[PDB]
Amino acid sequence: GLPVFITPGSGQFLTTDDFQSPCALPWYHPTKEISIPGEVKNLVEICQVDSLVPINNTDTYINSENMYSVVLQSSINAPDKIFSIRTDVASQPLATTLIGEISSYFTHWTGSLRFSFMFCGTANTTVKLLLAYTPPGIAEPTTRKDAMLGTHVIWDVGLQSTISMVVPWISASHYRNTSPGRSTSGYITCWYQTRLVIPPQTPPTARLLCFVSGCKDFCLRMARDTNLHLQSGAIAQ
Amino acid sequence: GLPVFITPGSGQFLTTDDFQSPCALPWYHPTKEISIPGEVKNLVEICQVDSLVPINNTDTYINSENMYSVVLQSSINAPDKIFSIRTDVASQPLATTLIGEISSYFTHWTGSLRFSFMFCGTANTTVKLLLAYTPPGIAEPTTRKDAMLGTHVIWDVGLQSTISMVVPWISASHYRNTSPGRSTSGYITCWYQTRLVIPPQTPPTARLLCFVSGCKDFCLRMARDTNLHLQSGAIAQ
């Protein structure tokens, strides 16, 4: 018998261990693997995709598509806010978007974010919006002036429906909490740069969509259980 | 199964063990480290700093700065004692000084000590003190004669406020107890060599400060809990 010595921890089960273990099916030879389109290796792969942001989550649109679109008026002739949202990936309403949802499985995160906007109004309909991310440390900008002093992007709708713009990871620290306290990553206000303009004979409203994906930059860590989903009481077999 | 053999001690938890242990957060990648001024590696680094000695700890000055200073009289015209203290680093009042406090976390110690004194009286104020360390094996010297037969240092205040002087580690044994019994490391008496002298129109008292730090020499061992601080009854969350 090789003089051995038992170690504090021994005999303990750990859901995140990594040991070998005898096989129950010796000499088994698993179905040979095959050519199977579009695999996946690392989650990030996901977060790097455009999911639609549920921007309009009033009790009003809450269980329709209409929560995913935002409407613009040909009648509005001023520096008017159009909407805003917290930045933290697992902030509302982002949280429920692919990336947000994925993030919701980790405790930490860092990177820049890729928000994309698609105009939908008639081809003859023009406009110029202003997309602005405002660094935390202050509170939601109230005026357009107040907004545009931060990182922003004047969007001219003309021919190419979309316009991606970025939320530069800009933190005091390296990583940030997937679940934020009272701490914020700033917000993204939306403003009228010009005025949604149409011709005679044209819808006077305009649908506007919003997506999010993580940049070459983005990255998650600290694996943890998701909150964006629950189970109370058993599932039937 | 590799014939192995279990060892007396096994399965035991030891607060001072050193074993490996599975990680709870696999594939985690900790925040990259950064350039961060004035690090630290080994405590000693501390003990090698000048902390102020609470020399004057009468019930009188006990919760003010004035316990850190000692006052001298222009009116005293004689070989008069001014103050004294035990040497053991965790002796009172040293104990509470950086070094003392640090030492108070180990059971053993050895080295020489660096005591420094700073005069504070007007620039025109002169004096000559006598700083004397008296080897243990005897008791507090009562006269100045009695004092100066031991290791000492005649201090002339002139221009350079301070004057460091050393307590040579002088032990029968190599190390000594951080917590002393009735055993002592001698003491450090302070005497009037001349007489604190001033001109006409001058404060007739003089503040005198005292610090301590460990020499290239100094060294601690046997890690143990500190006594210079307690907790009775829980801390609120």
């Binding site: 010796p26 000499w27 | 014939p3």
Partner: peptide, 25 residues
Amino acid sequence: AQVSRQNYFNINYFKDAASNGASKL
């Protein structure tokens, strides 16, 4: 002494022929 199945080590800690693990093919 280590090998390849359907890399790992395996000598016999035991002195008797039967003591040994499951055969190969």
